[PDB]
Amino acid sequence: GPLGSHLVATSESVTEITASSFVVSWVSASDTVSGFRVEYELSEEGDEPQYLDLPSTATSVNIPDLLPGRKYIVNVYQISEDGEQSLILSTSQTT
Numbered sequence: 001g002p003l004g005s006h007l008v009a010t011s012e013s014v015t016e017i018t019a020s021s022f023v024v025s026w027v028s029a030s031d032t033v034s035g036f037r038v039e040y041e042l043s044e045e046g047d048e049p050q051y052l053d054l055p056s057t058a059t060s061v062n063i064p065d066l067l068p069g070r071k072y073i074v075n076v077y078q079i080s081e082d083g084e085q086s087l088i089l090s091t092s093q094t095t
Contacts, residue, residue, distance in 0.1 A: 020095030025060035033078040043071040
C-alpha cells in the first residue's frame with residue numbers, strides 16, 4: 001500500500017553530507033533541454049552565487065564545498081537548444 005509514503009526513501013535522502021554537501025534531483029521538465037544549470041547561494045550572507053552546468057541527461061547533482069550551519073537557496077534551470085533557461089525546481093536547505 002502507500003506505506004503512507006514510507007518516506008520509503010530512507011537514507012537521509014541527503015547523503016553527501018561531507019562539507020555539508022547537498023544532493024538535489026529534479027525532472028528534465030523538457031526533452032529539448034541542451035543542459036542544466038544549478039545555482040546556489042547563501043540565503044543569509046547573500047554571498048556570490050555559484051553555477052554548475054550539467055548535460056541535458058543529468059537530473060541530479062551534488063553541491064560540495066557547502067558551509068555547515070548555513071542556509072542555501074537552490075534553483076535548477078534547464079537550458080534549451082536556444083540557450084533559454086527555465087526554472088524547473090527551486091528549494092532551500094539548511095546544512
